[PDB]
């Protein structure tokens, strides 16, 4: 919650130049490689034994795709993410039981990825915007848990 | 680090928690599901119905490694060792989670140990449990 | 947090039976005794040097029943914690400069400290019911921070 | 624990951090402060905005404290144990808080190291800079 004007413009210039199936792909990767007890929710996409094993898995990166897509959907709604994760945090909870601590480890490795595919354009001050979307993405998908 | 200090009220407190261990461990848990929701995604497979015996179960087993670890308390990663391998290689619950049962073992004593739940007790037993928990996630990556 | 109807009331019956005198000085004393570093906050205090010490201090224990009397007045408004914490909160962040993770700590404690006075009164859905409360109490007063 | 190629990766990452050590300890506080305001509530005594001498400053304390744990990454307890002992009863910032700036490190880091930034090296720094954060924090109780 409470982005202000400008960092919701900063936000959107930025995502703009996404590649969003890319981006996914590489940030579900990175949070196998770098948290690697997070694999525990994947072991039906087979080779995940080494850094490049994750990476380069074809399972991780198709599934990176649909995750940062409705990742990608929940920016227009930035007002009222809880709604709009509504319905995916009730899957998560209920039929993939999934911690939502792991939503908060997504969320620091997607601005990781971030930093890393556009060097000092990913400001301070952008950074700080996209902090609060994570935080809010990660809040929103943690909400119906029960 | 624990204190001799800490040993000694950890000792004293688990002795007087003494044969109640398992169904403490066991109500330590059905607190943590309760009061911390999201602990129940590491459960998915259990019986969760009130007064579960799988749960009951499984206090037991949190229990007893707990009083192996009084027990070993100058050795904690040695005494821990293959229960730490299960859970870096297995379980894979994300650590966070070990505070909230760190917590709910810590109500549990309170609520049952009236005259040995002194400050300098608390302090040494949330210590204590923090070390173990420390243990227990120490071979994740 | 949301609570139930059947919890608010669990929360109610429970604190109408709470010395706030005896609780607001243990959870405080408690707080700087198990997590000393908090210490940090209170020099003025005066002798903080032994558990004896803290829990005995005047200060501490005349500062704990004013810090559980704001509480008390947190349960007449569970509905809005955020409103009516709103001042506090400002206070904490720009005049006592306090990071709010230690608010977590305090309702740890206090937690701890009701469960150590009512025993097995202190049931598992009673405890649930007040995890949300201090949650509540926690991120209502960390909510105006900046 | 570190491993070999943890190591490996660490004293090649940060070797080639080099003389931006200072630099980048500056701007990740900056990134910190940006992200997470509660982390000024440690710093009231300081001007924390874009350009500040003193950020500056305590970035490049912070910089060179990991520089030294880098050409000491076997004995970080005692090689940092001056400055754990100073976090522990001075300045006593909540452990929350060195995830915080751990990670803005690390996105510091990524914007900075486009080649070195690899997934396998991005995990070796999150260890490191989780173990130094462990070091500062063990003589807290
Ligand atoms: C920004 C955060 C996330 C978003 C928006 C998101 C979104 C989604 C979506 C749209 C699906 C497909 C739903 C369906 O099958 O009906 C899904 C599935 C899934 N998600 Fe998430 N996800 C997120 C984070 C995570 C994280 C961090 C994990 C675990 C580390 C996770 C675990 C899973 C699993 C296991 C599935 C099912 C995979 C399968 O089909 O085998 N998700 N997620
Ligand atoms: C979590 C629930 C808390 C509540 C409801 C609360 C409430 C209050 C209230 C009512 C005051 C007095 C305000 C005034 O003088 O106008 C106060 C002061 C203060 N609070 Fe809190 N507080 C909480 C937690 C904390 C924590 C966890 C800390 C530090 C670890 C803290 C640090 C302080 C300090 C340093 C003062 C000023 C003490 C002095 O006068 O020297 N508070 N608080
Ligand atoms: C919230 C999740 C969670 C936490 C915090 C946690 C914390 C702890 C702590 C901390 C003090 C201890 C001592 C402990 C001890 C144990 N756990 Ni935990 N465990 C947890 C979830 C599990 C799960 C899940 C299993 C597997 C249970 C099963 O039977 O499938 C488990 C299994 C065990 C076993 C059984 C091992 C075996 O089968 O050989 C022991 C013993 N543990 N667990
Ligand atoms: C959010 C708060 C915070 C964090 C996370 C943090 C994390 C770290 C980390 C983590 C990797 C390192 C290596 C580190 C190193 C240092 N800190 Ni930190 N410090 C923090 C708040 C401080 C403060 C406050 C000071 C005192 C600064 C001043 O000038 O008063 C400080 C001072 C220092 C000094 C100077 C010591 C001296 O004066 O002798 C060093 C070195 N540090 N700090």
């Given at each position: 919650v409470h982005l202000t004007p400008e960092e919701k413009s900063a936000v959107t210039a930025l995502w703009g130049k996404v590649?969003?199936?890319?981006?996914?792909?590489?940030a579900l990767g990175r949070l196998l490689v770098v948290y690697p007890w997070t694999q525990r929710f994947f072991e039906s996409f087979?080779?995940?034994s080494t850094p490049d094993a994750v990476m380069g898995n074809p399972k991780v990166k198709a599934h990176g795709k649909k995750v940062l897509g409705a990742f990608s959907d929940?920016?227009?709604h930035l007002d009222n993410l809880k709604g709009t994760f509504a319905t995916l945090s009730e899957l998560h909870c209920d039929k993939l039981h999934v911690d939502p601590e792991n939503f908060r480890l997504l969320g620091n490795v997607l601005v990781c990825v971030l930093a890393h595919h556009f060097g000092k354009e990913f400001t301070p001050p952008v950074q700080a915007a996209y902090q609060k979307v994570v935080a809010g993405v990660a809040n929103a998908?943690?909400?119906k848990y029960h | 680090?624990?204190?001799?200090?800490?040993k000694t009220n950890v000792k004293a407190a688990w002795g007087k928690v003494g044969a109640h261990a398992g169904e403490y461990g066991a109500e330590a848990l059905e607190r943590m599901f309760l009061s911390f929701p999201t602990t129940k995604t590491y459960f998915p497979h259990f019986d969760l119905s009130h007064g579960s015996a799988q749960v009951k179960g499984h206090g037991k087993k949190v229990a007893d490694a707990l009083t192996n670890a009084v027990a070993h308390v100058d050795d904690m990663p040695n005494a821990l060792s293959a229960l730490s391998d299960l859970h870096a290689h297995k379980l894979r619950v994300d650590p966070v989670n070990f505070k909230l049962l760190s917590h709910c073992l810590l109500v549990t004593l309170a609520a049952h140990l009236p005259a040995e739940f002194t400050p300098?007790?608390?302090?040494?037993?949330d210590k204590f449990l923090?070390?173990?928990?420390?243990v227990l996630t120490s071979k994740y990556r």
């Open positions: 590649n969003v199936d890319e981006v996914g792909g590489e087979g080779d995940l929940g920016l227009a998908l943690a909400h | 680090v624990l204190s001799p200090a800490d300098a007790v608390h302090a040494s037993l923090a070390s173990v928990s420390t």
